């Protein structure tokens, strides 16, 4: 039914990335998916950055491994990746302090921290200059509510610090409340970021969708990804107007992860499966998942960080086995 294969640009990245990419490749071959990766890596002559863009204009999806290293930043600018989505959802076999959590964190990522011209006035005096606007608050408020309906979510919570930021965070929640009208099927609520962090640890089950501006987003992604199982189980994706890049969810997992074959690949394989559902290859997205979610419940194979001692190379290779005709999926 699929003549040829959809081209997906892949930047493997620096460090445990390629090793994680290789895991995506092997689980893809095994899986009989019609997708072709092409990779351009990533400081001397950054011709690659336009070499990458060209590819990106041609394919308009990607898989990244987080260039450990303005490199990453200038790429996202050129692509105008304005929305970031992290899916914090507990795997069933992998027990944590917060189980059966299903949350999704949409954070703005064009403005806020990611602008903020900084300069010096006096020796010993540094100054930060963050910008919040309505253009980009409206944009991410629209995304959230569109997503919240496309995925069947019932609640959007806008996270803010309008206590201290009188105007700027004030401005944001106006656009959220403006946009929230269009979707009356969707419960809207706001919450303070200090309060929300504490609520996220106590009763995290109270949220559906969280949409927040940039400062507070980089923090809640990791805070949430902890509840669910850690930095190697949580996937994410970022959205341009026309683009889409898929990747790992937790941003700064470890100061150094050095040592081959120990990193867990559940993040990329689940990111990657989510990637397929974007390419509307819905059945392979639903089987790469079902395999990964069912090697976890079987508990035999687990990675150092998840419990057991099994390596990357053997945690991968047990997934293929489970995709490779050993899956049921006969429920219609």
């Amino acid at each position: 039914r699929v003549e040829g294969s959809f081209p997906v640009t892949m930047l493997p990245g620096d460090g445990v990335g390629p090793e994680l990419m290789h895991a995506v490749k092997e689980v893809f071959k095994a899986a009989a998916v019609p997708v072709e990766f092409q990779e351009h890596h990533l400081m001397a002559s950054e011709e690659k950055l336009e070499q990458v863009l060209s590819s990106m204009k041609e394919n308009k999806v990607a898989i990244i491994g987080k260039i450990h290293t303005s490199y990453d930043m200038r790429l996202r600018r050129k692509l105008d990746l304005f929305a970031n989505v992290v899916h914090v959802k507990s795997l069933p076999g992998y027990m944590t302090r917060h189980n059966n959590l299903d949350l999704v964190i949409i954070r703005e990522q064009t403005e806020g921290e990611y602008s903020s011209l900084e300069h010096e006035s006096a020796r010993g005096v540094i100054e930060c200059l963050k910008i919040v606007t309505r253009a980009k608050s409206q944009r991410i408020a629209k995304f959230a509510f569109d997503y919240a309906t496309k995925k069947g979510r019932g609640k959007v919570t806008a996270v803010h610090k309008a206590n201290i930021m009188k105007l700027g965070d004030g401005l944001f929640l106006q656009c959220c409340e403006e946009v929230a009208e269009l979707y009356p099927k969707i419960k809207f609520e706001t919450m303070i970021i200090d309060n929300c962090c504490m609520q996220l640890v106590q009763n995290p089950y109270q949220f559906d969708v969280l949409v927040m501006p940039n400062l507070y987003g980089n923090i809640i992604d990791n805070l949430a990804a902890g509840l669910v199982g850690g930095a190697g189980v949580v996937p994410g994706e970022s959205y341009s107007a026309e683009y889409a890049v898929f990747e790992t969810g937790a941003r700064h997992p470890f100061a150094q992860a050095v040592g081959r074959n120990i990193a867990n690949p559940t993040a990329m394989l689940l990111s990657a499966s989510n990637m397929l559902r974007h390419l509307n290859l819905e059945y392979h997205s639903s089987m790469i998942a079902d395999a990964v979610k069912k090697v976890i419940k079987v508990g035999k194979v687990r990675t150092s960080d998840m419990g057991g001692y099994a390596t990357c190379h053997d945690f991968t290779e047990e997934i293929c086995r489970r995709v490779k005709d050993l899956d049921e999926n006969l429920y219609f």
């Binding site: 921290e113 010993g124 540094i126 930060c128 200059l129 640890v201 923090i219 805070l223």
Partner: protein
């Protein structure tokens, strides 16, 4: 030394809880004279508001002032009283500790970390404005002066309070200049006291790991750009914002030890308001007036009033009253 310590009433729930502490402080009869006051924003002559000037004295004579709640200053767009007290006495540090209450069952069971937040500037020097329709701009600043100063304090709090190592928390990727400076002033104070191990972690890195395994930290020093996020996040780990204490240390030795409740008058006056904070907020304040022996008693009675399992408050999985709690401690400080 029979010391006097000013005591702001606390609006809303403040009365029930402030006098609850007093009455529990009667039980071990600590040498504390409660020179009552209040700090309801008053408007000063030169234009900018000023505090009640008997408090500005009572606490410039006495040095430890124990606070309570603060009526939300939503009356008009005017200075917030909390902001006045911090600026007046120049309390440049806010120290909130987090210990796992052994009675209270919560998923995180082995938590003993302290979050020192620098309380001079950063977020608290907030200047947002407008540049065109729907284009707000914020201006925050971090100064080398008060960076080192909280880097200094923070090691001192480890030594003084017998704390193995120290973690500076930051975002030296996103904002290299503002935090690199704040790191730098910590790195210099690291060499000063090499009996205390010093690491650096990202704000993100911390959050991810403290929610999985919070045991690994114990003191965290962090500028004010982030605010109470990291500290309020931990509060959840030990469970509740009403069992966690806070205290603003200040220059010239002045210091206000406070709770971090709100002003919800709902059960306020229903003789059912949990005062477990301002009590532990003052157990700190005794420990800051050398009263180690007068406080370790107040505390273990409160920890084993909760570990008890009947004489609780309704805010902590029970049904009873602040009156039953205060007295169960009162009988157990006498052993």
């Amino acid at each position: 030394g029979v010391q006097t310590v000013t005591l702001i009433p606390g609006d809303g729930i403040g009365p029930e809880i402030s006098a609850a502490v007093m009455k529990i402080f009667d039980a071990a009869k600590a040498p504390i004279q409660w020179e009552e006051r209040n700090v309801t924003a008053i408007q000063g002559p030169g234009g900018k508001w000023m505090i009640p000037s008997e408090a500005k004295e009572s606490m410039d004579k006495n040095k430890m002032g124990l606070k309570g709640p603060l009526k939300t200053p939503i009356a008009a767009g005017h200075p917030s009283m909390n902001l006045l007290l911090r600026k007046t006495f120049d309390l440049y540090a806010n120290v909130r500790p987090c210990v796992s209450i052994e009675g209270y069952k919560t998923p995180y069971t082995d938590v003993n970390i302290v979050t020192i937040r620098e309380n001079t500037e950063g977020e608290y020097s907030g200047i947002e404005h407008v540049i065109v329709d729907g284009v707000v701009q914020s201006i925050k600043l971090i100064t080398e002066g008060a960076s080192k100063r909280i880097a200094e304090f923070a090691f001192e709090y480890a030594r003084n309070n017998h704390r193995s190592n120290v973690t500076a928390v930051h975002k030296a990727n996103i904002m290299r200049m503002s935090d690199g400076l704040f790191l730098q002033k910590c790195r210099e104070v690291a060499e000063s006291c090499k009996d205390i191990k010093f690491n650096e972690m990202y704000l993100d890195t911390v959050c991810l790991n403290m929610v999985q395994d919070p045991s690994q930290f114990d003191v965290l020093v962090m500028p004010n750009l982030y605010g109470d996020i990291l500290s309020d996040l931990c509060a959840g780990l030990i469970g509740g914002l009403g069992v966690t204490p806070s205290g603003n240390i200040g220059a010239n030795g002045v210091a206000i030890f406070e709770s971090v409740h709100g002003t919800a008058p709902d059960i306020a006056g229903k003789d059912m308001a949990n005062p477990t904070a301002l009590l532990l907020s003052a157990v700190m304040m005794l420990r800051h007036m050398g009263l180690f022996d007068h406080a370790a008693r107040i505390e273990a009675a409160c920890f084993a009033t909760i570990k008890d399992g009947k004489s609780l408050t309704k805010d902590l999985g029970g049904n009873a009253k602040c009156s039953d709690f205060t007295e169960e401690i009162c009988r157990r400080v006498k052993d």
